[PDB]
Design a protein around this ligand. Structure first.
Ligand code: RET
Ligand code: OLA
Ligand code: OLA
Ligand code: OLA
Ligand code: OLA
Ligand code: OLA
Ligand code: OLA
Ligand code: OLA
Ligand code: CL
Ligand code: CL
Length: 264
């Protein structure tokens, strides 16, 4: 049902996608160790924001690892090209994993925005419901990326509505609570918003690849886009969230944070 299943791949195409996914794994698990060691310099009220980055690194790293082994399982070099065997490859499992990872990315934002108690719970709940609506309708949409492009588009339009509404909640909370943030991170959090807008928008672009580039090179393009998007939305984003957590910790008088920023 996926466009990947339609084509044979050159050695070049097949190896590049393998390398993309493998590099993706390495980057996320490398970053994991960074988030782990810096977590001790985060104040208790923000430390879960850095923990969530560890959780996202392993979740994302595992899905990329799984995709890579699925890639090599599904294809074998036969008569001059990589051809589909008995096992299958699908991006569908990325969608399932987003059900977990996207709420994690959203929660760590709310934490460094200094949201607490009732407002934190309510905002998280609405954000997660919006994200889940986006992911599920998109998941259903991509079931038709071969059989019914028109249906892919309509589900994608519904999904985009959830996307836009989710982004509006995010933007509203960010620009409203920006003033509450310490150590100059009121400026930093603004760049985080635009990083999210940029990186997350790469995913619906990948989603539409079967509509504007339905060939093996389009398959490569989609994996390339996912790689850019994953690293930007999880790793670079995580690094900024953690920086913001540490800076606000130091400004709030957390000594290990102050000492850490002092060494650099
Ligand atoms: C780490 C993974 C992330 C941040 C995934 C984000 C995914 C999206 C923003 C997905 C968006 C979609 C649309 C807005 C329309 C097409 C269907 C989706 C689900 C791909
Ligand atoms: C930076 C270099 C990126 C690697 C290019 C891989 C594409 C190829 O070798 O076919
Ligand atoms: C934050 C950005 C992260 C960027 C990750 C991507 C790094 C590698 C990118 C690709 C370089 C282009 C490779 C040339 C493609 C060759 C075509 C092919 O063989 O199929
Ligand atoms: C392989 C990676 C091993 C990573 C172990 C690092 C332990 C961190 C110690 C700590 O800060 O609590
Ligand atoms: C095939 C029917 C798809 C139904 C989509 C349900 C939308 C989910 C909304 C928020 C949870
Ligand atoms: C909750 C939103 C559920 C779906 C809204 C209906 C619009 C998209 C469904 C398309 C159905 C189809 O193409 O057969
Ligand atoms: C051409 C790859 C980069 C595309 C970035 C533009 C999409 C995100 C816009 C906000
Ligand atoms: C080419 C440009 C690629 C961008 C690479 C991003 C690298 C890591 C981001 C680190 C986040 C630090 C937050 C900003 C620090 C500060 O405000 O002074
Ligand atoms: Cl604290
Ligand atoms: Cl993920």
């Amino acid at each position: 049902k996926n466009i990947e299943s339609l084509f044979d791949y050159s050695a070049g195409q097949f190896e590049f996608i393998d390398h993309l996914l493998t590099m993706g794994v390495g980057v996320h698990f490398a970053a994991l160790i960074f988030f782990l060691v810096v977590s001790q310099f985060v104040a208790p009220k923000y430390r879960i924001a850095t923990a969530l980055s560890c959780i996202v690194m392993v979740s994302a790293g595992l899905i990329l690892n799984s995709q890579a082994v699925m890639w090599t399982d599904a294809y074998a070099y036969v008569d001059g090209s990589y051809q589909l065997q008995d096992l299958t490859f699908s991006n569908g499992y990325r969608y399932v994993n987003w059900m977990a990872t996207i709420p994690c990315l959203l929660l760590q934002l709310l934490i460094v925005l200094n949201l607490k108690g009732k407002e934190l719970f309510s905002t998280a709940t609405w954000l997660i419901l919006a994200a889940w609506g986006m992911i599920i309708t998109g998941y259903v949409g991509q079931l038709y990326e071969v059989d019914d492009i028109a249906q892919l588009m309509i589900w994608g339009a519904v999904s985009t509505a959830f996307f836009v509404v989710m982004n509006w909640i995010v933007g509203t909370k960010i620009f409203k609570n920006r003033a509450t943030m310490l150590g100059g991170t009121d400026s930093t959090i603004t760049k985080v918003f635009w990083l999210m807008m940029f990186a997350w928008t790469l995913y619906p672009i990948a989603y539409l690849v079967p509509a504007f580039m339905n060939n093996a090179d389009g398959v490569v393009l989609r994996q390339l886009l996912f790689t850019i998007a994953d690293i930007s939305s999880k790793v670079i984003y995580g690094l900024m969230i953690t920086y913001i957590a540490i800076q606000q910790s130091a400004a709030a008088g957390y000594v290990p944070a102050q000492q850490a920023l002092g060494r650099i």
